[PDB]
Amino acid sequence: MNIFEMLRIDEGLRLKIYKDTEGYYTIGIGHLLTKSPSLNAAKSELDKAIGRNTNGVITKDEAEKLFNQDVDAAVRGILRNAKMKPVYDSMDAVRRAAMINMVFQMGETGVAGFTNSMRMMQQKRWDEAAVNMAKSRWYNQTPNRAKRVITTMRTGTWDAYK
Numbered sequence: 119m120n121i122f123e124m125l126r127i128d129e130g131l132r133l134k135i136y137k138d139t140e141g142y143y144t145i146g147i148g149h150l151l152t153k154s155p156s157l158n159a160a161k162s163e164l165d166k167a168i169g170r171n172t173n174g175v176i177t178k179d180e181a182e183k184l185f186n187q188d189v190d191a192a193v194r195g196i197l198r199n200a201k202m203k204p205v206y207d208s209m210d211a212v213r214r215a216a217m218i219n220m221v222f223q224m225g226e227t228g229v230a231g232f233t234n235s236m237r238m239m240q241q242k243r244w245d246e247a248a249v250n251m252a253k254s255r256w257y258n259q260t261p262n263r264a265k266r267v268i269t270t271m272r273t274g275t276w277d278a279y280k
């Protein structure tokens with residue numbers, strides 16, 4: 119297991135524009151297209167991202183293409199972030215994967231809003247961090263995924279994904 123498979127589990131694969139769990143137009147493997155209510159704008163954002171006239175549908179390879187880009191951008195987002203970098207650097211590979219998943223889903227912004235857990239993380243107080251992370255809208259909204267990511271963080275193993 120690795121970050122790619124992990125996220126592929128959590129996000130799924132849809133080759134047609136769909137609405138995510140927040141009602142936002144998405145496609146591929148969790149690629150958010152736009153927060154606007156218009157499918158047109160969505161369709162438009164998709165064509166711009168793919169470089170062709172998609173008509174709201176892409177092939178698998180294209181989905182994988184966005185996916186690579188988005189994982190790469192999440193990592194690079196973390197590394198450019200003054201609050202997060204040090205937390206990420208302090209952790210082992212499994213736990214880093216958990217942090218990337220959170221950023222991929224919530225944006226550097228949304229994650230960056232877990233200061234308190236991140237501090238516990240950096241201190242290696244896993245159980246506590248897990249408890250704190252659970253008091254969040256994130257957890258209340260997507261509890262099963264949240265649980266998977268929290269156990270990965272708590273344990274440093276991929277058990278939640280096996």
Ligand SMILES: [Cl-]
Pocket residue numbers: 167
């Ligand atoms: Cl893009």
Ligand SMILES: [Cl-]
Pocket residue numbers: 259260261262263264
């Ligand atoms: Cl869920």
